[PDB]
Protein backbone atom coordinates (compact mmCIF):
# COMPACT_ATOMS: atom_id res chain seq x y z
CA UNK A 1 0.00 0.00 0.00
CA UNK A 2 1.00 3.62 -0.80
CA UNK A 3 1.37 6.05 2.13
CA UNK A 4 -0.37 9.23 0.98
CA UNK A 5 -3.17 10.77 3.02
CA UNK A 6 -6.43 11.99 1.54
CA UNK A 7 -6.31 15.78 1.38
CA UNK A 8 -2.53 16.22 1.67
CA UNK A 9 -1.49 19.66 0.48
CA UNK A 10 1.23 18.29 -1.84
CA UNK A 11 -0.87 15.34 -3.09
CA UNK A 12 -0.41 16.26 -6.77
CA UNK A 13 3.38 16.14 -6.38
CA UNK A 14 3.23 12.62 -4.98
CA UNK A 15 0.80 11.24 -7.57
CA UNK A 16 2.77 12.76 -10.46
CA UNK A 17 5.49 10.17 -9.72
CA UNK A 18 3.19 7.11 -9.79
CA UNK A 19 2.37 4.59 -12.52
CA UNK A 20 -0.91 2.71 -12.99
CA UNK A 21 0.13 0.05 -10.50
CA UNK A 22 0.87 2.51 -7.69
CA UNK A 23 -2.44 4.38 -8.09
CA UNK A 24 -4.20 1.12 -7.22
CA UNK A 25 -2.38 1.10 -3.86
CA UNK A 26 -3.98 4.31 -2.57
CA UNK A 27 -6.29 4.22 0.45
CA UNK A 28 -8.89 6.33 -1.42
CA UNK A 29 -10.50 6.66 -4.85
CA UNK A 30 -8.46 8.49 -7.49
CA UNK A 31 -9.72 9.57 -10.92
CA UNK A 32 -7.71 11.64 -13.39
CA UNK A 33 -9.67 13.74 -15.92
CA UNK A 34 -8.68 15.88 -18.86
CA UNK A 35 -10.21 19.33 -19.31
CA UNK A 36 -13.30 17.85 -21.01
CA UNK A 37 -13.97 15.29 -18.27
CA UNK A 38 -12.66 12.24 -20.12
CA UNK A 39 -11.34 9.62 -17.71
CA UNK A 40 -7.55 9.14 -18.00
CA UNK A 41 -6.96 7.03 -14.89
CA UNK A 42 -9.32 5.32 -12.46
CA UNK A 43 -7.92 3.32 -9.59
CA UNK A 44 -9.05 0.11 -7.92
CA UNK A 45 -10.20 1.78 -4.68
CA UNK A 46 -12.66 3.91 -6.64
CA UNK A 47 -14.14 0.83 -8.32
CA UNK A 48 -14.46 -0.76 -4.86
CA UNK A 49 -16.63 2.21 -3.85
CA UNK A 50 -18.79 2.47 -6.98
CA UNK A 51 -18.90 -1.01 -8.50
CA UNK A 52 -17.34 0.15 -11.78
CA UNK A 53 -14.65 -1.82 -13.55
CA UNK A 54 -11.72 0.61 -14.09
CA UNK A 55 -10.91 -0.98 -17.46
CA UNK A 56 -14.40 -0.22 -18.79
CA UNK A 57 -14.66 3.41 -17.64
CA UNK A 58 -11.24 4.64 -18.82
CA UNK A 59 -11.71 6.82 -21.90
CA UNK A 60 -15.37 7.55 -21.18
CA UNK A 61 -16.64 10.97 -20.20
CA UNK A 62 -17.17 11.24 -16.45
CA UNK A 63 -19.88 13.90 -16.51
CA UNK A 64 -21.85 12.76 -19.56
CA UNK A 65 -21.69 8.95 -19.36
CA UNK A 66 -20.27 7.53 -16.13
CA UNK A 67 -21.51 9.93 -13.40
CA UNK A 68 -24.57 11.97 -14.45
CA UNK A 69 -25.41 12.66 -10.82
CA UNK A 70 -22.29 14.88 -10.78
CA UNK A 71 -23.54 16.93 -13.74
CA UNK A 72 -24.71 19.76 -11.48
CA UNK A 73 -23.52 23.24 -10.45
CA UNK A 74 -22.12 21.87 -7.18
CA UNK A 75 -19.79 19.32 -8.80
CA UNK A 76 -19.38 19.67 -12.58
CA UNK A 77 -19.84 23.44 -12.23
CA UNK A 78 -16.95 23.79 -9.78
CA UNK A 79 -14.78 21.59 -12.03
CA UNK A 80 -15.45 23.85 -15.04
CA UNK A 81 -14.69 27.03 -13.04
CA UNK A 82 -11.42 25.48 -11.90
CA UNK A 83 -10.38 24.38 -15.38
CA UNK A 84 -11.10 27.89 -16.70
CA UNK A 85 -9.47 29.82 -13.85
CA UNK A 86 -6.41 27.56 -13.67
CA UNK A 87 -6.89 27.12 -9.92
CA UNK A 88 -8.78 24.03 -8.77
CA UNK A 89 -8.55 22.92 -5.16
CA UNK A 90 -11.80 22.22 -3.37
CA UNK A 91 -13.35 19.71 -1.00
CA UNK A 92 -17.03 18.97 -0.46
CA UNK A 93 -19.40 16.16 0.42
CA UNK A 94 -21.61 14.52 -2.19
CA UNK A 95 -23.89 11.52 -2.71
CA UNK A 96 -23.18 9.02 -5.50
CA UNK A 97 -26.47 7.38 -6.43
CA UNK A 98 -26.47 6.40 -10.15
CA UNK A 99 -26.91 2.64 -10.63
CA UNK A 100 -25.70 2.01 -7.08
CA UNK A 101 -26.89 2.13 -3.49
CA UNK A 102 -26.83 5.84 -2.52
CA UNK A 103 -23.37 6.39 -1.03
CA UNK A 104 -22.17 9.48 0.82
CA UNK A 105 -18.59 10.52 0.01
CA UNK A 106 -16.09 13.30 0.56
CA UNK A 107 -14.68 14.66 -2.69
CA UNK A 108 -11.39 16.52 -3.25
CA UNK A 109 -10.82 18.01 -6.70
CA UNK A 110 -7.36 19.38 -7.49
CA UNK A 111 -5.38 20.37 -10.58
CA UNK A 112 -2.54 18.03 -11.54
CA UNK A 113 1.06 19.19 -11.13
CA UNK A 114 1.47 19.72 -14.89
CA UNK A 115 -1.69 21.86 -14.89
CA UNK A 116 -3.29 20.16 -17.92
CA UNK A 117 -5.28 17.41 -16.17
CA UNK A 118 -7.30 17.23 -12.97
CA UNK A 119 -7.73 14.81 -10.08
CA UNK A 120 -10.96 13.82 -8.35
CA UNK A 121 -10.34 12.06 -5.01
CA UNK A 122 -13.07 10.13 -3.19
CA UNK A 123 -13.44 8.52 0.22
CA UNK A 124 -16.42 7.21 2.18
CA UNK A 125 -17.84 9.25 5.07
C1 LIG B 1 -23.54 9.77 -9.86
O1 LIG B 1 -23.92 9.59 -11.03
C2 LIG B 1 -22.12 9.39 -9.58
C3 LIG B 1 -21.58 8.37 -10.24
C4 LIG B 1 -20.21 7.91 -10.10
C5 LIG B 1 -19.24 8.52 -9.27
C6 LIG B 1 -17.94 8.03 -9.20
C7 LIG B 1 -17.58 6.92 -9.98
O2 LIG B 1 -16.32 6.43 -9.91
C8 LIG B 1 -18.53 6.32 -10.81
C9 LIG B 1 -19.82 6.82 -10.87
Author numbering: 1 to 125
Paste lines from the article.
In these experiments, bacterial proteins with different functions were investigated. Microcrystals of photoactive yellow protein (PYP), a blue-light photoreceptor from Halorhodospira halophila, were used to explore the capability of microsecond X-ray pulses. A nitrite-reducing enzyme, cytochrome c nitrite reductase (ccNiR) from Shewanella oneidensis, was exploited to investigate potential secondary radiation damage, caused by 90 µs pulses, at heme centers. Finally, a first TR-SSX experiment was performed on the photosensory core module (PCM) of a bacterial phytochrome from the nonphotosynthetic myxobacterium Stigmatella aurantiaca.
PYP is a small protein (14 kDa, 125 amino acids) that covalently binds p-coumaric acid (pCA) to a conserved cysteine residue via a thioester bond. We used both a fixed target and a tape drive to collect SSX data from PYP microcrystals on beamline ID29. The PYPPEG crystals belonged to space group P65. The PYPPEG crystals diffracted to higher resolution than the PYPMal crystals. PYP in space group P65 only forms four contacts between symmetry-related copies within 5 Å, while in space group P63 eight contacts are formed. Despite the denser packing of the P63 crystals, the crystals grown from PEG diffract to better resolution. Microcrystals suspended in viscous PEG are best used with fixed targets and tape drives, both of which were used in this study. The highly diffracting PYPPEG crystals were used for calibration and detector geometry refinement and for optimizing the key parameters for data collection from other proteins.
